[PDB]
Design a protein around this ligand. Structure first.
Ligand SMILES: Nc1ccn([C@@H]2O[C@H](COP(=O)(O)OP(=O)(O)OP(=O)(O)O)[C@@H](O)[C@H]2O)c(=O)n1
Ligand SMILES: Nc1ccn([C@@H]2O[C@H](COP(=O)(O)OP(=O)(O)OP(=O)(O)O)[C@@H](O)[C@H]2O)c(=O)n1
Ligand SMILES: Nc1ccn([C@@H]2O[C@H](COP(=O)(O)OP(=O)(O)OP(=O)(O)O)[C@@H](O)[C@H]2O)c(=O)n1
Ligand SMILES: Nc1ccn([C@@H]2O[C@H](COP(=O)(O)OP(=O)(O)OP(=O)(O)O)[C@@H](O)[C@H]2O)c(=O)n1
Ligand SMILES: Nc1ccn([C@@H]2O[C@H](COP(=O)(O)OP(=O)(O)OP(=O)(O)O)[C@@H](O)[C@H]2O)c(=O)n1
Ligand SMILES: Nc1ccn([C@@H]2O[C@H](COP(=O)(O)OP(=O)(O)OP(=O)(O)O)[C@@H](O)[C@H]2O)c(=O)n1
Ligand SMILES: [Cl-]
Ligand SMILES: [Cl-]
Ligand SMILES: [Cl-]
Ligand SMILES: [Cl-]
Ligand SMILES: [Cl-]
Ligand SMILES: [Cl-]
Ligand SMILES: [Cl-]
Ligand SMILES: [Mn+2]
Ligand SMILES: [Mn+2]
Ligand SMILES: [Mn+2]
Ligand SMILES: [Mn+2]
Ligand SMILES: [Mn+2]
Ligand SMILES: [Mn+2]
Ligand SMILES: [Mn+2]
Ligand SMILES: [Mn+2]
Ligand SMILES: [Mn+2]
Ligand SMILES: [Mn+2]
Ligand SMILES: [Mn+2]
Ligand SMILES: [Mn+2]
Ligand SMILES: [Mn+2]
Ligand SMILES: [Mn+2]
Ligand SMILES: [Mn+2]
Ligand SMILES: [Mn+2]
Ligand SMILES: [Mn+2]
Ligand SMILES: [Mn+2]
Lengths: 144, 144, 142, 142, 142, 144
């Protein structure tokens, strides 16, 4: 239920968006819990991007080294956050378009059920149905 | 003068803006010092929102539970910040349009005086005057 | 039916003032008002204000912007639009009736439960907004 | 050659859904698709969707937006454009050939190594993307 | 008096380069230049560049953009504008004279103390910018 | 290689962009390692700016006091981040347009070389060449 997460950041005013899209995908294949970009505004009228990576506290060296190798930054800053995470498991749910996996999260008496995006998007593509139509059909089916 | 503040964050790529506007207002009625949204850019070409909540360090359970109940997130991250806060009190200031409350903040020999928005906005609405006209009239009156 | 778009960049106004003008503009009958974060000269974080409205409301919306913001001028233009046909359905849920906007286009049909109904009933019955939103989707499903 | 721009503001759709529609629109032949973060009424963080495309693809791109997003209508307009002349050069590097887009305008000449080639070879040879990008610049220099 | 707007999306240029082009464009006589953060294909954080200027400066501003940025083309259009009447007042403060822009529209009258004067005197007299700005408002009040 | 950095933040919904551009430059002349702005979305439909300042851990009082004097904020929050920084030195590199300084950063066996912006921008201005043309000429020359 309770763990910790490492957050690593770096500001980039000297790298292309092309290069940043590449490193986002390098970081996820490296096992980062999450990667995101925040538009920031830096000195000398430069539009810039802040890179944030969340990962296991023990992955400090891995993620740091990846960032210094693949981005233009000279340094990284990092710090540990505490976390509260719900318990999670999966249910196979039958819908009008086929089976969809649904993540079931519980925390004390809080409970929510989230259809898997990739499952819904594949079925929307296959059957030429809007993604939102399939996702909602999965939500109805979850209501069971 | 010196205290600490708890910061709680969560990234949301699976929730509507409608839902986020609702939770912002749920969080403030719950006693959060501040709530804000930051546009971020997440994996799989998803535009997302980071939710940040500042509050009392002792409100960890309250604010965490509210977020997990009202948002789609599976976990939250949180951490404690130190703070330096000016001393604050209120003055009733008479202006050409009626009384306006002004927050007077002092820190060592730093001092600034901030007219209350709601007081100025009500009077601008009532008398059909631009908000900035009333706010500046309150700033002049503060100069006393 | 065409729409008027009015824009103005603001680097010399507080956020407090901008929240005020959004609500003045909405009560004046603007179709929509939104802010876009921009970055302007001399290292200024700024905001672009966009107002969408009826073309015949050009003078009203212009006047409010020039009165309530710091901008010296506004720029405007008309956009053509394509709008789906729209009607509303009221659906019964365990929490009361919820109106659902039903939009159609050619062979498109989609359903957006009304925000005001889901939020009102969510507060009233002390349940998450998503709980009421989903019950309206279930109710629609029959 | 003119370009069509289509816009729609979305405060009632998930990011997951928006990533899906960007890829539907790109596979439909849109020139470009991008998102702009906006701030809408009632404290809603929102996204503006912009689609750039061929003017003759107006009905296709409109239909996809109204089918796959939550918007009730779209607004559109045509922009004039000025486009540089463009050709491609293949340059030999220690990692293989890399195509380079060469754009010219009057007396302007500039070189952008092709992203797909630099990324493919960077993964293949386990070197940073910038390492391959720079080697293509060196290769261009002779 | 109408205004020209030129746009271009950039996912393949550094921020360093973009700060350079903003200052080239301003010295070339652009009315305004600003950046808007956008999100483009293939998970790229990007920047939209907007240039506002005189319609007769279309070719100059286009040439600078195609020379100094990575974009292959630009899109442009003309917006109509409504501009308030404007004049300037010099007001005496404890820190020197400060020019105040006075803008009027119908029965609107508003006052924006000039940034360059408040900033120059704030540095000169080692006081906050807001302190000089407010003293100009007081000075205006009589 | 390994140090720490102090991060100070403040949200501003009651200050002009003009005022923020001024304080960014006040902060850099004060010796901040970095200053940046993040657009955020605050209560009551206010578009706002978050101010972030990175600096030496021992500059807490300096940077705090500057912010409370020059911005509208009533308080600041701050916290210490750990950092991993590459070793850095400078090389004078001869290019087709004159000498350009290049920062050479190394970390274990990671190495990258970054031409100085001001050197390239001056030469682009002087010789009426695009900045990107000069910067790339410096990158080629670095490849040595
Ligand atoms: N910051 C995060 C985000 C992810 N997770 C965990 O890692 C998994 C990945 O989250 P998710 O968004 O579901 O990843 P994917 O399934 O790969 O992608 P998608 O968003 O399409 O579902 C989740 O189960 C979550 O519990 C985490 O620990 N920390
Ligand atoms: N991050 C924050 C922001 C607020 N405050 C305190 O909480 C009060 C709320 O701040 P304020 O913005 O003034 O709230 P309101 O008065 O409700 O709204 P408004 O902005 O319109 O004045 C302030 O006095 C401030 O001292 C705080 O401790 N931490
Ligand atoms: N860009 C827009 C936005 C709105 N409208 C018109 O304005 C009405 C109000 O729009 P909406 O945002 O839905 O207002 P509410 O329903 O009050 O807000 P909510 O999103 O909470 O449902 C719409 O039905 C539509 O007719 C429009 O024509 N063009
Ligand atoms: N605003 C735009 C964007 C694209 N195009 C056309 O679409 C093509 C594809 O654009 P691009 O972004 O370069 O696609 P890719 O080359 O596939 O992507 P990448 O950036 O990775 O090279 C361009 O050559 C151009 O002819 C256009 O006319 N107008
Ligand atoms: N969108 C714009 C912006 C500027 N201008 C013209 O350009 C002049 C310069 O604009 P401004 O931003 O005020 O320049 P400065 O006064 O130099 O900058 P500052 O904001 O620091 O006062 C204005 O007076 C106006 O005539 C314009 O016509 N259209
Ligand atoms: N957050 C940061 C950023 C800067 N630095 C250090 O401070 C110096 C300033 O960084 P840089 O961006 O190179 O500053 P300038 O050279 O002044 O400006 P420019 O970006 O144009 O090179 C760098 O050498 C870097 O090592 C730092 O310690 N912490
Ligand atoms: Cl750092
Ligand atoms: Cl997290
Ligand atoms: Cl304008
Ligand atoms: Cl726009
Ligand atoms: Cl519209
Ligand atoms: Cl274009
Ligand atoms: Cl705070
Ligand atoms: Mn730098
Ligand atoms: Mn099955
Ligand atoms: Mn998943
Ligand atoms: Mn997810
Ligand atoms: Mn009284
Ligand atoms: Mn207050
Ligand atoms: Mn100005
Ligand atoms: Mn509605
Ligand atoms: Mn009740
Ligand atoms: Mn709506
Ligand atoms: Mn290409
Ligand atoms: Mn391999
Ligand atoms: Mn491209
Ligand atoms: Mn001026
Ligand atoms: Mn001095
Ligand atoms: Mn406030
Ligand atoms: Mn020499
Ligand atoms: Mn430098």
């Amino acid at each position: 239920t309770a763990d910790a997460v490492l957050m690593i950041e770096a500001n980039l005013d000297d790298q292309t968006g092309e290069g940043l899209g590449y490193v986002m995908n390098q970081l996820l294949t490296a096992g980062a819990y999450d990667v995101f970009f925040t538009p920031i505004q830096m000195k000398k009228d430069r539009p810039a991007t802040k890179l944030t990576v969340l990962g296991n506290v023990n992955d400090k060296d891995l993620l740091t080294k990846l960032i210094l190798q693949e981005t233009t930054t000279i340094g990284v800053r990092y710090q540990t956050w505490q976390r509260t995470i719900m318990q999670r498991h999966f249910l196979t749910v039958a819908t009008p378009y086929g089976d969809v996996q649904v993540k079931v999260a519980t925390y004390q008496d809080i409970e929510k059920k989230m259809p898997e995006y990739a499952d819904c998007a594949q079925l929307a593509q296959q059957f030429h149905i809007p993604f939102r139509t399939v996702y909602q059909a999965a939500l109805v089916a979850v209501d069971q």
